[PDB]
Amino acid sequence: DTVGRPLPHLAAAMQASGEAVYCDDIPRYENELFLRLVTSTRAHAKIKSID
Amino acid sequence: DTVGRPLPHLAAAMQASGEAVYCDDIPRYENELFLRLVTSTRAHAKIKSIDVSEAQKVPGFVCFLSADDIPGSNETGLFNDETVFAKDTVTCVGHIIGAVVADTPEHAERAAHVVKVTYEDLPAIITIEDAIKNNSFYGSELKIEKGDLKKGFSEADNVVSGELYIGGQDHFYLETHCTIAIPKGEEGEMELFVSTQNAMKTQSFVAKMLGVPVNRILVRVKRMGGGFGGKETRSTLVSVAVALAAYKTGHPVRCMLDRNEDMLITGGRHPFLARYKVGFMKTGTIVALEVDHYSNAGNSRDLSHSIMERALFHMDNCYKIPNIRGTGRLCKTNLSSNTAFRGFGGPQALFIAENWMSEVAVTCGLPAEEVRWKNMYKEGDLTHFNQRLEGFSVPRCWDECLKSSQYYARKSEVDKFNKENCWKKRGLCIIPTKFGISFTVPFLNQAGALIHVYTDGSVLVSHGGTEMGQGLHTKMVQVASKALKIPISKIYISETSTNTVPNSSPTAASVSTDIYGQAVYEACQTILKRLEPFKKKNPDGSWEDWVMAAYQDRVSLSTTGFYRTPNLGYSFETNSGNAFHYFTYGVACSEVEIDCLTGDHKNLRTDIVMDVGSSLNPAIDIGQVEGAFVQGLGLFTLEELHYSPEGSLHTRGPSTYKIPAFGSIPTEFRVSLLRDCPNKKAIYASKAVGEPPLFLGASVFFAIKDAIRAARAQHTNNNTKELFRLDSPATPEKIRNACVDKFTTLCVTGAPGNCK
Amino acid sequence: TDGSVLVSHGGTEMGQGLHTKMVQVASKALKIPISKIYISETSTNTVPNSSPTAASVSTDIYGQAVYEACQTILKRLEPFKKKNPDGSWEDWVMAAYQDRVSLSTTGFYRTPNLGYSFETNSGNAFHYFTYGVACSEVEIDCLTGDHKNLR
Amino acid sequence: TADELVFFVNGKKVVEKNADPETTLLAYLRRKLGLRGTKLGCGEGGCGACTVMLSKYDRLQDKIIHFSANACLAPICTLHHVAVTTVEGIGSTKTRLHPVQERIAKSHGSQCGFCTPGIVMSMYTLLRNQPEPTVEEIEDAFQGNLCRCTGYRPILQGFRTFAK
Amino acid sequence: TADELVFFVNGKKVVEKNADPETTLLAYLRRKLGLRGTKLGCGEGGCGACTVMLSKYDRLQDKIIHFSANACLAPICTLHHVAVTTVEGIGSTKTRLHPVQERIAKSHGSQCGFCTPGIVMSMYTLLRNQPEPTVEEIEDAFQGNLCRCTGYRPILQGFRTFAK
Amino acid sequence: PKQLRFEGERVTWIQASTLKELLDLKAQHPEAKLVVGNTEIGIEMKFKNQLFPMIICPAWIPELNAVEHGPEGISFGAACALSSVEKTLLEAVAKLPTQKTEVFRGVLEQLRWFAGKQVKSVASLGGNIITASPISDLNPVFMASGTKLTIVSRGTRRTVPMDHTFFPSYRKTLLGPEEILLSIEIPYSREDEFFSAFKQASRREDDIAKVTCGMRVLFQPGSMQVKELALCYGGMADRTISALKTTQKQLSKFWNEKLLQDVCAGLAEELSLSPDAPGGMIEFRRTLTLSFFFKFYLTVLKKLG
Numbered sequence A: 001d002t003v004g005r006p007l008p009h010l011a012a013a014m015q016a017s018g019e020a021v022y023c024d025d026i027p028r029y030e031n032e033l034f035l036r037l038v039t040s041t042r043a044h045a046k047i048k049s050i051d
Numbered sequence B: 001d002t003v004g005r006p007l008p009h010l011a012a013a014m015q016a017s018g019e020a021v022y023c024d025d026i027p028r029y030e031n032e033l034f035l036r037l038v039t040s041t042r043a044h045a046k047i048k049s050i051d052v053s054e055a056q057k058v059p060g061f062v063c064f065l066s067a068d069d070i071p072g073s074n075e076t077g078l079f080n081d082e083t084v085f086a087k088d089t090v091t092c093v094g095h096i097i098g099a100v101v102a103d104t105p106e107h108a109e110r111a112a113h114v115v116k117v118t119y120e121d122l123p124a125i126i127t128i129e130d131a132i133k134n135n136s137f138y139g140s141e142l143k144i145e146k147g148d149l150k151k152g153f154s155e156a157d158n159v160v161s162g163e164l165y166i167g168g169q170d171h172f173y174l175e176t177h178c179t180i181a182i183p184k185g186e187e188g189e190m191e192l193f194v195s196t197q198n199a200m201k202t203q204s205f206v207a208k209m210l211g212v213p214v215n216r217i218l219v220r221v222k223r224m225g226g227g228f229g230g231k232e233t234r235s236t237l238v239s240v241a242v243a244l245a246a247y248k249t250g251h252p253v254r255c256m257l258d259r260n261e262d263m264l265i266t267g268g269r270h271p272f273l274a275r276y277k278v279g280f281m282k283t284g285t286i287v288a289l290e291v292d293h294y295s296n297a298g299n300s301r302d303l304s305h306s307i308m309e310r311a312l313f314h315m316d317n318c319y320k321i322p323n324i325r326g327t328g329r330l331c332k333t334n335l336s337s338n339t340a341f342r343g344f345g346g347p348q349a350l351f352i353a354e355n356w357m358s359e360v361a362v363t364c365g366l367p368a369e370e371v372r373w374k375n376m377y378k379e380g381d382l383t384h385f386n387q388r389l390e391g392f393s394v395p396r397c398w399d400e401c402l403k404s405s406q407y408y409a410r411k412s413e414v415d416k417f418n419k420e421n422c423w424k425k426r427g428l429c430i431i432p433t434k435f436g437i438s439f440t441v442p443f444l445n446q447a448g449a450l451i452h453v454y455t456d457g458s459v460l461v462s463h464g465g466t467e468m469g470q471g472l473h474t475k476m477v478q479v480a481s482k483a484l485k486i487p488i489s490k491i492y493i494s495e496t497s498t499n500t501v502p503n504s505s506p507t508a509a510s511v512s513t514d515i516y517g518q519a520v521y522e523a524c525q526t527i528l529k530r531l532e533p534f535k536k537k538n539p540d541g542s543w544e545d546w547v548m549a550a551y552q553d554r555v556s557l558s559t560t561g562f563y564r565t566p567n568l569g570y571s572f573e574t575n576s577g578n579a580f581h582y583f584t585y586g587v588a589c590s591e592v593e594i595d596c597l598t599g600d601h602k603n604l605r606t607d608i609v610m611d612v613g614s615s616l617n618p619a620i621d622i623g624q625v626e627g628a629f630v631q632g633l634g635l636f637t638l639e640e641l642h643y644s645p646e647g648s649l650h651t652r653g654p655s656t657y658k659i660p661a662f663g664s665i666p667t668e669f670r671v672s673l674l675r676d677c678p679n680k681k682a683i684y685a686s687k688a689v690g691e692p693p694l695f696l697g698a699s700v701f702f703a704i705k706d707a708i709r710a711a712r713a714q715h716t717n718n719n720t721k722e723l724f725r726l727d728s729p730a731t732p733e734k735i736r737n738a739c740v741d742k743f744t745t746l747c748v749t750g751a752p753g754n755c756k
Numbered sequence C: 001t002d003g004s005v006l007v008s009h010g011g012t013e014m015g016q017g018l019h020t021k022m023v024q025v026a027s028k029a030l031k032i033p034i035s036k037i038y039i040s041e042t043s044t045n046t047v048p049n050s051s052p053t054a055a056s057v058s059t060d061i062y063g064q065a066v067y068e069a070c071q072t073i074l075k076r077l078e079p080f081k082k083k084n085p086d087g088s089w090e091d092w093v094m095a096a097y098q099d100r101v102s103l104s105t106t107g108f109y110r111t112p113n114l115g116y117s118f119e120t121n122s123g124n125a126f127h128y129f130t131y132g133v134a135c136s137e138v139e140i141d142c143l144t145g146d147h148k149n150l151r
Numbered sequence D, E: 001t002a003d004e005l006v007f008f009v010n011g012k013k014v015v016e017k018n019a020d021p022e023t024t025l026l027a028y029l030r031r032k033l034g035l036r037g038t039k040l041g042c043g044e045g046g047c048g049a050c051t052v053m054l055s056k057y058d059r060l061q062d063k064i065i066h067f068s069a070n071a072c073l074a075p076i077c078t079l080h081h082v083a084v085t086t087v088e089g090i091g092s093t094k095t096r097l098h099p100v101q102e103r104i105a106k107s108h109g110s111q112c113g114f115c116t117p118g119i120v121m122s123m124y125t126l127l128r129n130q131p132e133p134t135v136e137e138i139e140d141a142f143q144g145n146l147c148r149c150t151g152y153r154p155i156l157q158g159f160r161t162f163a164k
Numbered sequence F: 001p002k003q004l005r006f007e008g009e010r011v012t013w014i015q016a017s018t019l020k021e022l023l024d025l026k027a028q029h030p031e032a033k034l035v036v037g038n039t040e041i042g043i044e045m046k047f048k049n050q051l052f053p054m055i056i057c058p059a060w061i062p063e064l065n066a067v068e069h070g071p072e073g074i075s076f077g078a079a080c081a082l083s084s085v086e087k088t089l090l091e092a093v094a095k096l097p098t099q100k101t102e103v104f105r106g107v108l109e110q111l112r113w114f115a116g117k118q119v120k121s122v123a124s125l126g127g128n129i130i131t132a133s134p135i136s137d138l139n140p141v142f143m144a145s146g147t148k149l150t151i152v153s154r155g156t157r158r159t160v161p162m163d164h165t166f167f168p169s170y171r172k173t174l175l176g177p178e179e180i181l182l183s184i185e186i187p188y189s190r191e192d193e194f195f196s197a198f199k200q201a202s203r204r205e206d207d208i209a210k211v212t213c214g215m216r217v218l219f220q221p222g223s224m225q226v227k228e229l230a231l232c233y234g235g236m237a238d239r240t241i242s243a244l245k246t247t248q249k250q251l252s253k254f255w256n257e258k259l260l261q262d263v264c265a266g267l268a269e270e271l272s273l274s275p276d277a278p279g280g281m282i283e284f285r286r287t288l289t290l291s292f293f294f295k296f297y298l299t300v301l302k303k304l305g
Ligand SMILES: Cc1cc2nc3c(=O)[nH]c(=O)nc-3n(C[C@H](O)[C@H](O)[C@H](O)COP(=O)(O)OP(=O)(O)OC[C@H]3O[C@@H](n4cnc5c(N)ncnc54)[C@H](O)[C@@H]3O)c2cc1C
Pocket: B655, D044, D045, D046, F033, F034, F035, F036, F037, F038, F039, F040, F041, F042, F078, F079, F113, F114, F115, F116, F119, F122, F123, F124, F125, F126, F127, F128, F129, F130, F131, F135, F136, F137, F138, F179, F180, F181, F182
């Protein structure tokens, strides 16, 4: 029974050793592509065209 | 409500478009490596050395893996009598010694070929006869006995004794064994994509070899390109190796076997040798039977004991025999370990039964159908293992098959053909079958499901069963849809996984529809109970309305379901307790024409009548009957494995191993499902269909044996009651050799000889 | 069937140590060491319709869900415990498996008595309140606007 | 100092600058082009799981010709100026299935589905050579394709609709 | 005739035959070498999530020098004959943790864990120059490392154990 | 159309555009391996783990693809696909009188349940011949019919009838290391000439012990008196063989029961297999050699009468 005990965060050791996997740490598939958002530079505007 | 409707297999369109993903179709990670097994070329030998010097010169070579590389345990297999990688000795020709890992499958292949092994040969045992002579068996004798054999034989008018052999069979699933193992690099975690019927054992065996808890290992199965029992246990041979490579390298690793590796390494159906003695009256009524069975089990136990148990349960076929003793022994040999194959010992035992029954009819000089009919069980009879036959439908199938196949009329036509033809002959036979439904191991008769309802009303079902082409997922969707009273378009099953339903039995024994159907049904009942208050408040609302009301009222929309088959547990020590939940029945009539000069034959017409209760899906069920029958046709007439005297398999691909082809099937091929025979014991009154029909393929074998009899009456002797041994499979060699004439004897040359 | 336990719950780990707490909870409830329990990830195919991991209540609510599921497991194991009282967790799990008792369960918790109305100013808005006090001392540099947090 | 290898796959040009003579078409399709509808069932010409259609302009006969082949045995180095059609070339559930794909699916001629692409390509090739075949030509079209699940009856019954 | 770039990463030789001047060390480590312990947190030098240790032979003061750097701003083209050390180069849960890794973990200095490798590398670098630092030197080592979770107290407390 | 060169990690491939280029290359590198359909070479590399560092592909060369109708028979370039051979022969059979198509009809019988459409569309005629498998279904037909082979190298050109001498040993042909097979002429049948071909309907070993045969008889004009007899068998030895001892004894004998007996006695002796012969099926194979001749014997009688 560890309830009430100061048990370290279970992933802490793997986090210190860089073994903990975060989303971008997942290996890429051979055919994996990459996305970048195109974003408004105006607070309020009609979009006339996109080139 | 689609239950009872011929809905196409849910993935059929995707399979026809090449969009359905099988294990090796999964995209590769950028860093993914490939594994190729290194395998023994000797039946029995000490390993003196393994030389990897030349393999290391192959571009893209990563490493060679052996037993020394295993972090946890090198002990594996169902009974812990196998190695992951052979250490000191090899005990069959495809015994896994190690593996090569490389950057491409071509490079892995190249490197594995250049690995040199040095051996010191040991005395090997290859044949059942070898094993018998050497007392080389796994465990002791299995036996079922009823009545008094001395006495039965005293009362008999005639006695016939003999010996029979039935060769094994390669599964020849179109998709060979395949595993991808992805190491996460945290806490021993690994995710595996596997072509397996047994995710639970895959998970267990991987965990054991790595020495990590089972909770670290996730096994996922979307679908298999065929299993037929061959992926029930032997899939772990590849899975465990790939997992070790993933562990050792820290990269994703995959392996898919080449056909020739798969045929050599993974095992097949058990060959059986039987020695039998039957006592009978001049009427054809059976009074005593004694059968000793021996299976060629190969170099580990695996499922061999349960297979032999199932064989002993089916040695009666459909016949009442008051004095009976069957025994079975498992031969321990230097051949790849044999395993489950559709029918699981049943087809072998049923073949042996039909063989002696055919000899009874010949010896009595009576029509075969008459002798079979006379000896058939009745409703409510006890089997040799004391189980009551409730709902015994063989008589109905028999009479329907006789009528619809026009047996008696065609029998006259076969006789007319044989009168008018000298070097070709026809044969015709009608055979019944019964097949016990349930795992022979009582604890495996359990099933789980997990159902989620999402807030748009869409439903995700997961169950312990795996899809291998039998249409299990389709049937489960039909069941869920009926149970919940919503369209099938609202229900989806994605895959089988160990993190959704744990501890699942292998998808096997033909009972998956029954047990997972029940588990899904129960989960569905829970959901319905939870939604009932919302339905009551809003009776003209939609499913979507009720689901959203439940969600907003904080009612859980996720549940497990579980089913355990009741009243099971046979005792070999009391010869009592139910071995099976119920029985599936069927009858098949087949006609053939043989070329007495070449041993070639044509399958002219087959009629099948099967009792499948009230079919959940007649299209899937008819497809199962046709498929099983053709595999049985292969077993008894086409498929032949051949080994060198040193125990090395010769037949390792489609060029040398012939499974049924488009051109092999009967010209007229008719299947009927019996009408108005609901099964009270299973989901929506249905019955298991996967395995029961395979033995009906033997109708072709016994039609061939009929034609041979006519050939022998033409050209060999004048003895109408002569018994000749015809082993299975009835290949052109066996058929030709059986047609003894002026050519086989060399009488055509002027020599004297043993023909007319 | 080795007795290792896999726990899934609707909550996500973002550094707050929720999975650690859930393992501590499960270990206490099951009366087995934390080394036997693992939480691998959060997924929509294990626990559907999950609330966001938010409002500081994940420990309270998933803790209760995990607790309830553990209680179900204990009830199912109880007969096997009584048959083998000097046996181990692993023996009891395998006996249960071989007797075809399910070793999988859901757990669910719904916070009671919540329902404030802005049109009546009544009904509980919260389950309970968390409280605290802080005392801080600073030194400011009146010529630069910089400050030091002293204590 | 090697030449470029140039062939077409489902209507799209492939330029392979470093063709290895050892590379099979099946390997190229699956592991370079990522077209995994075409399957490995044996690697020795017996099973037809890897069946594709090849087309070329035949300089002896003038004719454009269309024929089936086993991708497991075809070196890519034989394919300069040849067009390859795979199962994904003729139709899909995301556009429209070809009648060959529709028929086999709806006639219950696909169980595990592993042989289905190969059978689809054999039937497609026949129809591209003979828009109205006989029942006889149809059965003979499949000597090179094996199916372990179906017992063949439903595949033939489905495709018989194309005859006469 | 573009030159080879040669450097070392965790004791292992890297020969880049086709180095692009625009490539950062962080992109190289993560996306070519597959060493994902080093993190992108900003890409502008302010957060230290991408901290690695660099070592070189200093022709001037003779010695091998060790210093910390942001992999997100280091052009790989600056690294010819430099040795790179990352978090995976100092210890792991599979073999043995370095004291720095063990202490931050056990001291509750890691919550989400995203800044932890960078902070480990900052502390490791300090100890490689000064194996017995002062409390004052310890806090100074972390001016370029941000943590959003811990409030910093437990990290300083765990590393104070290295002082005197 | 020009010569192309492909270079692999182990193998160099040359795609030859003309016959002259091919003969030059073959003279430059006698050990260079020819590949047309790769249906044998692919298996050898994959399963028999052979390596051929130099490969030439002659499939583009006119000649080698040519089909020519001549006075004595139909000539096929050696690179002609078996499907093209089958098509051409099926047309010849439909168009010509039965008495001229006996050999064609035998070829077609051997092609009936041979592989699949996939294999027959790429497998060449010349490749089957030169592969020289003991169990080739075509070589016994070509041998029994005296099919003519045109064989060429830089400088040399010769035409030989295929006979027993063409297959000296296991998987070997009577070609020089620099020679290539250019074309194959399948003969028209003459008056009083009859032909049959048969094959075993089982195969159990990769390239041995499957019985296949070509059988030919030529009578003296308008009689049943044997002028020529040829019985050639695959699957009875390590190569395609002729039962020369047996057939030689039948010359000027009449087609009757006595000939049937003598041939059968001869075949049982000449083709006898040892108990330990590779491939086994010893009794079956002997029985087939005799039963096939019996079928031929009765067919010839129906064709005579
Ligand atoms: C599944 C399948 C089933 C088969 N069934 C049968 C069967 O039932 N009966 C039967 O008899 N055969 C059968 N075969 C064998 C088939 O007929 C031969 O493999 C084929 O004809 C070889 O031709 P290829 O163009 O593919 O030869 P390749 O593999 O390209 O070459 C074959 C050999 O011939 C040499 N060669 C090729 N052309 C020439 C040339 N013109 N001059 C000199 N040498 C040359 C090559 O160097 C090589 O040694 C089968 C093959 C397969 C794959």
